[PDB]
């Protein structure tokens, strides 16, 4: 949904 970082 609303990610802080790219490695999700």
């Amino acid at each position: 949904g609303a990610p802080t970082y790219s490695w999700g």
Partner: antibody
Amino acid sequence: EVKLEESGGGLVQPGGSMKLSCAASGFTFSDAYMDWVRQSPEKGLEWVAEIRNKANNHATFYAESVKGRFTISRDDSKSSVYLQMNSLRAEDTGIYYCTLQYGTSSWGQGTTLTVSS
Amino acid sequence: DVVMTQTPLTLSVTIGQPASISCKSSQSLLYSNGKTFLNWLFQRPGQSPKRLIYLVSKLDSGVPDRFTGSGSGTAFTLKISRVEAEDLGVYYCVQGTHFPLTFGAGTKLELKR
């Protein structure tokens, strides 16, 4: 509502050990990465450690300053994430936050660690 | 790894007037999949940081509309259209493109007299 509540802070001597615990609720805990961040006047906000979800076999990652001294773990059944901290130093002093920064952002109230003789 | 530089370290603001703060990254925050993982956190004294902005310009749930994020590559800006009393505190930019997650040293919004 996403809730993170940390405990296990306190005063410890250099060389000493402390375990931080974080009880999470309000999201599917199994599926989230969990991240610890700390805050001190002198270093500001610093990422400390990450533990990944069951899919990534709970893969653990550490800041260079903390590698070999800290261990991040998780109990999927209790929705809890932990940070075992060994060989503590003065520079580890600060406020430790349990955070969800996986597909969203949520920060706990934090727990204070003081490393002093 | 990625160094985040915030200018001004302190901004003096009048309630009712706009604010603008800058964030610069030591390398591009553009990711392979086209996304740019720049976040803005806000911290009140004695309180935990709280994310306002993600993916450069997207507002978190319940964040007032006076907050706007912009930028690309290595240069980013947070703007407040009209400062309110609740907005006083420290703003941090946070880079989520390159492992480890890395933070600016913060910008303190202080009251002009």
